[model samples]
Target chain A: AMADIGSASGYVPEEIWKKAEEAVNEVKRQAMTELQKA
Target chain B: GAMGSMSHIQIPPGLTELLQGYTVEVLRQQPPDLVEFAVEYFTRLREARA
Candidate 1:
């Protein structure tokens, strides 16, 4: 439910958004490396 | 300027707005000389061409 990643900021612009952006980018990079390991 | 706008200069929208207000308010408790410095430095950066 929360994964609808484009939702508007209802109130607080949580600092967690910045944290999540960094986390997701790291995960995607790791996923790409795993793909290449095959 | 991709990092972020100065906290004291951006178009704040929520808790950040409240936080910035509190920061300025607290600075007012100090002597006026220091307050002047805060005002001058917090948002002095402007778009000036070469």
Candidate 2:
């Protein structure tokens, strides 16, 4: 479901979309870590 | 599925790189309205610098 965000048509490159996914996952991971620490 | 709405967003290069991880997470977890607002805010932020 979440992966579908990358497929939308636009000027943005596919590479950016892929990077977005990676970035988002990393943010989520970091958020979770901070959450646990808090 | 839900991404169709965001497909139209013409993310600029600087903004795209800046938002790499941040916006995606917001899209997945945050409400549509908030996501839209964040996009707009970031767009403005970029434009201001440019």
- Predicted structure with the largest DockQ when compared to the true one: 2
**Top TM-score: which candidate number?**
2
Instruction: Give chain B TM-scores in order.
Output: 0.29, 0.34
Which 10 consecutive residues of model 1 chain A have the lowest summed lDDT? Answer: A26-35
Tens digits of per-residue lDDT for model 1, B1-50: 46655433333345443333434443345455656755654545232333
* Candidate 2 clashes between residue pairs 3 or more apart in a chain or in different chains: A23-B21, A24-B21
C-alpha RMSD for every candidate: 17.4, 13.4
Q: TM-score for every candidate vs. truth?
A: 0.30, 0.37
User: CA lDDT, every prediction?
Assistant: 0.48, 0.54
TM-score of the A chain in model 2: 0.58
User: Tens digits of per-residue lDDT for model 1 on A13-33?
Assistant: 556555545544554455445
Could you give the CAPRI-style class of model 1? incorrect
Candidate 2 ranges with C-alpha deviation above 4 Å: A1-6, B1-50
